[PDB]
């Protein structure tokens, strides 16, 4: 999901993230390329108490 | 025997000195001692813990040891695991423990009993420990929690002021100086949701008790106080704690005491032991049907209770009814067998059904075993649309009821055509919250009805006082003649600029509607517009145009009610001719054609186009909405105030409408205003008197022009005003004018006058006269050909013309060097920081701005070193362009007249030199500090994404030079080079 | 006792375990009356439970 | 619906809305809301469809 | 997770097709069981075998057709959960269709 | 039930055979855990099912031959407790042998 969400738009902004559960799968795409850009926060929302 | 009190004698003070707050301590604990309060002192915690064992042994009647106790204590009290909203949860939900005793003996430790107020019992203390704090212990439980704070400090920044072990319990916070007094719903939120919620206890004609005193004498009773915060109190599922306004448990005592004397005077299946609330539209109705609902619930001899809505409006409201567990309000599964098992359920008895449901149940039962019993029934959306056999039903397939209506349409035998009266149905008025309640709470705004008299031709016709023979003049002759809308039209196109306060290309303002009659005038109507907008883009290529939008479907369907509403049209578009369906179908493409959308002709695709089309008008995008028969009643925008109004609405149906533009937005919205073509002033003052006296248009609708140009002392609240020239004479004469201020009373006294002056203003940009009069200042001499134009144009004949050039503005360039000298006092002390006594004002001077472009076309018109010191004035004439003054003047110094070769030339010109002296004097401002340059870009493109700069952000703390994490520095120069670039990105704010 | 339709409140059978395993002499055979407990979550919960 | 999701800002594309135990293409009606036309998405779904 | 719990999920999928496909014929409403008993089974590990281990179900079949005769034993789990929700439905429907079917008549 | 509660069944069983037979052979111990990891695999339906949702044990065989190619899909998920039960008692014989030889010299 990080190699089909990227590449060529390094444009304002990543991410936004519905059912977010964990950070895991926002964490490999911007992970691996923050030297790629910086543009913006990472938008999370979840249910779960423990998991949040 | 009531809380919220209709005759109440206003006490007062002698003094008793008002002024220290320490003395109004004094006086509240010696009030409260007198009403019947108690008070201690305890200076700890343990002696807190003692007073609640002291109460809850007089309570329960029972003993504790020191085991029992401690463990009670331990387990279900003071757990510090246990959170605030478990106190609270405590509070409203588990205020009963079961105790083991050590017999083992289950029993019962209530906290605060909810069936009595005899049993429950207050005592008051103050606090421990630079502030004045009084704390209303509730059987020894702290609830009530009043602040005192300075008297001359506002409300409103005293909003803004915010172990130990058991002040988790409190409930109400009561903040007030004396004078005014609001209390909150547990300190929740701040400055931004401030008071929405800071409601004020009032009396039963919802005038404000706004004192400490008379509040302390009403609201401060131990039966009122226990009767807000245990029976009309929610804590709502989850986080919420909500608190009801002061009409809505006024309404509910007066329900519930109507209910209890009516069954006392055994008074059932009467229309005189009825009755109806009438709140107004759009204030929440929901919390007030859901406590009403549950406290008829509540009584033992109440049989059943039904909340009956209609459609299909019974989904979305059974689940607001489902926010707090749990009424059981619901039978989808629609049956009257399985409703009559709903029925023989016991302890939650409240079940929402729409009245065709209920008729479904009288024409298909006829031997229900509830026909007998103590059935209460509430109404709501109150059209008459689905109402009449049903009644005639429940009085004929039933022999003991109520009902009660909550209703938005009153129908009086001032309004008959031929329908029942809501007297008649419902029986006494039992309690209103009108509009003049809301303007008077200031939770919604004013008006301005403007009748215009821009014909004397058609003026009969216009002031027609007959309806029936405005039926029979209902042509293209006497009401659609073509010169007729097209001199309306020319009046709207050149006003409407003017009232939606677009007077500048760098203001933000407002849209507006246009009410018309029927479809074939609409099709006529948005032709006429449309061709004459095409006529307006050719006259000089250089008008800016206007977006038209339009909806209808079908029809004027019934007649429906009494006078006299809106025919809310079905959603049927093929049901109209060929004409309008193929001219609707044009409109379609029309929005389809700019706005570039897929909206089909069926139902859903009109549908969408509907949601869609309020969608874009809700954000100020379409600025002119054509209006036949919706958007006037189930609609809200907060940035609408302007109303253009040509159609016969009547009583009521014209409140509905109005209140398209009284929803606040900021302080600049001051009121809605309403321009109409047909004379409806007189229809406007009999829904005065239908609302109630003649000291109603006193407050809500208007004073005249020349009571705002030179004031008026007020005769319903007794304010003292001064209007415009009063302002004019204080500006020219009692300073040093325009920018000859250097002393700091000065500063002071020119802001307490300027900004009375800016608003001042702000409301006279409303009016059409004083909007001719600053046109005064841009005719020709002589040129009749210009000023027929202009008086062409604003109908003014020469006795007018020469009547307002005697009066005399001050010059317009002057008042420009007033605003530049408000601005010098207000950037002069922003920063750092009896300065800080009136609030420097933001949000009109916020608007009215040029972002340079203007200028640049200011400097591409001046040919010519005639250029060369105008913009010098006018940088400091605008906010927010003080940085960018060099870079202007650089450009425009180095270059000339020959880098313009017209206008549009010179703003790229400007962008190229901007964008070149931003990566110049970045790379000088970067190279002066060795900042990382890559991480130094970064921060760069950065600070202008996100178009100012904060040390927020620790990349910027990655954008050190070399070091500064370490405790022996300055911290500078990083504090030193951040004001080095905030400077520089306020010069290059907006640019590149 | 079930004339006494929702009658607040829970603990009255509590008691009303109490005195029928009272029951002293001889060959008592009490002890033993302990299934009836309290969860429950809420004590309205468990009136309107318990009652039904 | 039984919210106001029926007059929501973003299922007035769908036309017809989500039934219960299929939640998932709500998240994907909610997905065109928040998507610029130069930006792409990536989401996963459940291959247990025909129609639904 | 329980058997009702599924049978919850497969009853409300069952009033999802007869509802909003308003469809008045026992033959297609069974082809609508079908389609929502089918839908409406777990598909966890755990979550199948706490149906499994729930009331209701037992381990055997009546059709031994629904079992592939190979290590697929998820499969036959499943196929008893699919053939115990169609004997439901099967009463199930047969309740709803004049249940439904006389109250949507409006 | 988890898999543990079985494991320490087994393991206590198989110390039992090693104890208090007193056999000092790899071969012969380990026909003592096709005794003892046998005999305590447990027998109502949820108890075998708990153990199933549990961690540690998978639905997949290695050995098929273990399966009866047939509706006994209880026999199916007792082999595969089986199955995890003999790995993990290899590798607690390989633990035990030379835990307890050593100890038992007295």
Redesign the interface.
């Known amino acids: 999901?990080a190699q089909?969400?990227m590449h060529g738009?390094t444009?304002?902004n990543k991410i936004?993230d519905?059912?977010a559960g964990s950070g895991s799968l926002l964490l490999q795409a911007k992970k691996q390329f923050d030297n790629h850009i910086?543009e913006e926060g990472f938008f999370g929302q979840e249910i779960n108490h423990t998991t949040y | 025997n009531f809380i919220v009190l209709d005759k109440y004698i206003k006490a007062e003070p002698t003094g008793d000195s008002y002024q220290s707050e320490s003395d109004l301590e004094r006086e509240l604990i010696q009030d409260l001692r007198n009403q019947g309060y108690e008070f201690i002192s305890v200076k700890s915690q343990s002696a807190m813990l003692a007073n609640v064992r002291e109460q809850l042994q007089n309570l329960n009647g029972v003993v504790f040891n020191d085991s029992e106790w401690r463990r009670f204590t331990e387990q279900y009290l003071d757990n510090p695991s246990d959170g605030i909203l478990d106190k609270t949860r405590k509070i409203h939900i588990d205020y009963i423990c079961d105790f083991i005793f050590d017999d083992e003996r289950l029993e019962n430790i209530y906290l605060i009993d909810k069936k009595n107020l005899m049993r429950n019992k207050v005592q008051i203390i103050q606090q421990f420990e630079n502030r004045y704090d009084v704390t209303i212990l509730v059987n020894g439980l702290p609830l009530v929690q009043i602040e005192l704070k300075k008297r001359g400090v506002a409300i409103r920044e005293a909003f803004n002021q915010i172990e130990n072990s058991l002040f988790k319990y409190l409930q109400l916070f009561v903040i007030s100086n004396g004078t005014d007094t609001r209390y909150f719903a547990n300190t929740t939120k701040r400055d931004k949701n401030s008071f929405d919620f800071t409601m004020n206890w009032a009396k039963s004609d919802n005038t404000l008790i706004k004192d400490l005193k008379d509040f302390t004498a009403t609201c401060f009773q131990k039966h009122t106080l226990l009767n807000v915060l245990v029976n009309y109190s929610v804590f709502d599922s989850s986080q919420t704690l909500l608190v009801m306004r002061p009409y809505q448990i006024a309404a509910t005592e007066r329900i519930l005491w109507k209910i209890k004397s009516s069954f006392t005077a055994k008074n059932w299946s009467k229309p005189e032991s009825g009755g109806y609330i009438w709140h107004t539209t759009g204030s929440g109705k929901t919390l007030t049907s859901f406590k009403a609902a549950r406290l008829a619930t509540e009584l033992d001899f109440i049989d059943k209770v039904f909340f009956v809505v209609d459609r299909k409006d019974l989904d979305y409201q059974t689940m607001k009814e489902y926010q707090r567990f749990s009424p059981d309000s619901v039978n989808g599964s629609e049956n009257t067998a399985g409703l009559k098992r709903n029925l023989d359920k016991d302890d939650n008895k409240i079940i929402v059904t729409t009245i065709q449901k209920l008729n479904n149940l009288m024409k298909a039962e006829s031997d229900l075993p509830v026909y007998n019993q103590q059935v209460v029934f509430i109404f709501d959306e109150c059209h008459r649309s689905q109402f009449g056999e049903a009644q005639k039903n429940l009085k004929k397939k039933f022999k003991r009821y109520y009902q009660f209506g909550f209703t938005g349409t009153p129908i009086f035998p001032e309004n008959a055509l031929g329908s029942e009266t809501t007297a008649s149905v419902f029986g006494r008025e039992l309690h209103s919250y009108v509009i003049t309640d809301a303007i008077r709470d200031e939770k919604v705004l004013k008006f301005k009805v403007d009748y215009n008299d821009v014909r004397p031709q058609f003026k009969s016709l216009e002031t027609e006082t007959d309806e029936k023979k405005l039926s029979a003049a209902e042509n293209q002759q006497a009401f659609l003649h073509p010169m007729r809308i097209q001199e309306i039209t020319q009046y709207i196109l050149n006003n409407f600029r003017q009232k939606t306060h677009r007077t500048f290309p760098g203001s933000k303002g407002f849209n507006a509607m246009l009410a018309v009659s029927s479809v074939d005038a609409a099709k006529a109507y948005y032709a006429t517009f449309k061709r004459l907008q095409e006529e307006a883009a050719n006259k000089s290529a250089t008008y800016k145009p206007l977006r038209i939008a339009t909806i209808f479907s079908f029809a004027a369907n019934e007649e429906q009610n009494a006078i006299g509403e809106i025919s809310d049209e079905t959603f049927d578009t093929s049901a109209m001719d060929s004409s309008a369906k193929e001219f609707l179908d044009a409109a379609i493409r029309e929005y389809n054609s700019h706005f570039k959308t897929n909206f089909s002709t069926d139902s859903n695709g009109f549908q969408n186009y509907y949601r869609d089309l309020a969608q874009r008008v809700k954000n100020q995008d379409i600025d002119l909405l054509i209006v036949v028969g919706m958007f006037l009643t189930g609609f809200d925008a907060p940035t609408l105030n302007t109303l253009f109004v040509d159609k016969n609405l009547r009583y009521h149906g014209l409140m509905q409408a109005f209140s398209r533009t009284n929803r606040i937005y900021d302080a600049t919205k001051t009121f809605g205003n309403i321009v109409t073509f047909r004379d409806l002033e007189r229809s406007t003052i009999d829904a005065i008197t239908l609302f109630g006296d003649k000291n109603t248009k006193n407050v809500v609708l208007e004073k005249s022009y020349t009571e705002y140009m030179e004031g008026f002392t007020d005769a319903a609240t007794g304010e003292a005003k001064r209007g415009f020239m009063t302002v004019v004479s204080e500006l020219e004469q009692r300073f040093p004018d325009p920018t000859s201020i250097e002393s700091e009373k000065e500063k002071k006294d020119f802001v307490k006058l300027f900004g009375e002056y800016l608003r001042a203003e702000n409301i006279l940009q409303n009016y059409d006269e004083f909007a001719t009069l600053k046109a005064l200042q841009q005719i020709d001499l002589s040129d009749p050909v210009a000023v027929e134009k202009f008086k062409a144009e604003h109908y003014v004949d020469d006795e007018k013309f020469a009547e307002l050039q005697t009066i005399r503005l001050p010059a317009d360039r002057k008042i420009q060097d007033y605003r530049s000298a408000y601005n010098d006092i207000r950037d002069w002390q922003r920063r750092e920081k009896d300065w800080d006594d009136v609030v420097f004002e933001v949000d009109l001077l916020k608007s009215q701005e040029i972002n340079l472009d203007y200028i640049l076309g200011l400097i591409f018109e001046h040919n010519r070193g005639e250029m060369i010191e105008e913009v010098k004035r006018l940088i400091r004439s605008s906010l927010g362009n003080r940085a960018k003054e060099g870079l202007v003047v650089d450009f425009i110094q180095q270059t000339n007249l020959d880098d313009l070769p017209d206008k549009a030339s010179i703003i790229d010109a400007f962008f190229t030199f901007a964008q070149r002296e931003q990566q110049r004097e970045a790379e000088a401002l970067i190279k002066e500090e060795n900042l990382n340059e890559d991480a130094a870009k970064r921060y760069i493109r950065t600070s202008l994404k996100r178009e100012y700069a904060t040390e927020n952000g620790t990349e910027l703390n990655e954008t050190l030079p070399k070091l500064s994490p370490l405790n022996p520095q300055y911290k500078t120069k990083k504090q030193a080079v951040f004001q080095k670039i905030v400077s520089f990105i306020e010069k290059f704010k907006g640019v590149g | 006792l079930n004339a006494d339709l929702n009658s607040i409140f829970v603990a009255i059978e509590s008691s009303a375990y109490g005195y029928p395993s009272e029951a002293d002499i001889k060959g008592l055979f009490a002890d033993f009356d302990t299934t009836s407990n309290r969860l429950g979550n809420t004590v309205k919960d468990k009136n309107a439970r318990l009652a039904a | 619906d039984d919210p106001t999701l029926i007059n929501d800002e973003r299922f007035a594309p769908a036309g017809v809305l989500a039934p219960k135990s299929k939640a998932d293409f709500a998240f994907v009606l909610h997905a065109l809301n928040y998507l610029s036309a130069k930006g792409r998405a990536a989401i996963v779904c459940f291959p247990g469809i025909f129609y639904r | 997770m329980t058997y009702n719990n599924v049978f919850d999920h497969a009853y409300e999928m069952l009033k999802e097709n007869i509802r909003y496909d308003d469809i008045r014929d026992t033959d297609d409403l069974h082809d609508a069981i079908h389609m929502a008993a089918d839908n409406a089974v777990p598909h966890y590990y755990a979550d199948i075998f706490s149906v499994m281990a729930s009331e209701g179900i037992d381990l055997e079949f009546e059709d031994s057709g629904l079992m592939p005769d190979t290590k697929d034993v998820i499969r036959i789990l499943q196929a008893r959960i699919y053939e115990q929700l169609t004997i439901d439905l099967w009463e199930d429907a047969e309740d709803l269709l004049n249940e439904y079917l006389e109250e949507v008549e409006e």
């Open positions: 999901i089909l969400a738009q444009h304002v936004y519905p059912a910086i």
